[PDB]
Amino acid sequence: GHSYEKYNNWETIEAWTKQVTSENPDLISRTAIGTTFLGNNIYLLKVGKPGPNKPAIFMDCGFHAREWISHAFCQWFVREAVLTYGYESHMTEFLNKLDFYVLPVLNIDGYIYTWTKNRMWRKTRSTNAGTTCIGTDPNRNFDAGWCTTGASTDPCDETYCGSAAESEKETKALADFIRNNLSSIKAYLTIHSYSQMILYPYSYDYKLPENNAELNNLAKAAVKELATLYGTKYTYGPGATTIYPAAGGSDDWAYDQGIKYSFTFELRDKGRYGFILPESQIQATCEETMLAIKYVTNYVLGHL
């Protein structure tokens, strides 16, 4: 069965998306925003007390198949929303005043593959012309300085940028959804691991966003709140100079669409376990991450 304290396979997560929606029809509705290369449904949970014309915060997890703590957190966040709504004042205010669009697993095909064949798989599982090599890095596949830096034109590389921007069904689906809801989505948050960082644009170039000062102070504040729980230390800054240049990322793309608050979260740890974070650390990781997420949410709320 499903546990928030364990890593769940796709079959279990998919059944979970239906069950948690069904158990909390007052707080959650579910759709799909598209299907994957292998025909899996890219579920999207809309979390909030329904109301006319509400602003939204968008969060995805599971861009990269092997970063399991990512998938775990989206699941954790939704449980926390439904558990604490009406019992903890900030989350109650949050769900009352806005919606969270939570996309629990973007790269479903790849995720299944880490469970069935290769735990260190990163990319999608789409085929490529002219080679047997599989998959595109979905976070090199967005239309933002696409394939200009930090990416590879070689399909056999794990940072392969795809045959074109949005060449992947999953990234096209995500891009399509955000454009179709641009006027309500006020923040874009994409969850990765690992490195313990909060990054913002830009990654495709060394240039800085016009609200650079604003984004740096917010990530800084967020990193502080995150630490308050266990002292976990996060770094922060523009993607390009903070971790490395990487064109085609969803955070940069979303920002260039006009979404002023765009962050990539790299969760635990800093390399000791890396992608294979032990399940015993799921709870603490998600708890401290909740604080940074809730702080950004509060901030967005008072800056509409």
Binding site: H64, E67, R122, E158, Y194, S195, Y244, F275
Partner: peptide
Amino acid sequence: XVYAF
């Protein structure tokens, strides 16, 4: 999450 950064 690129190996090994």
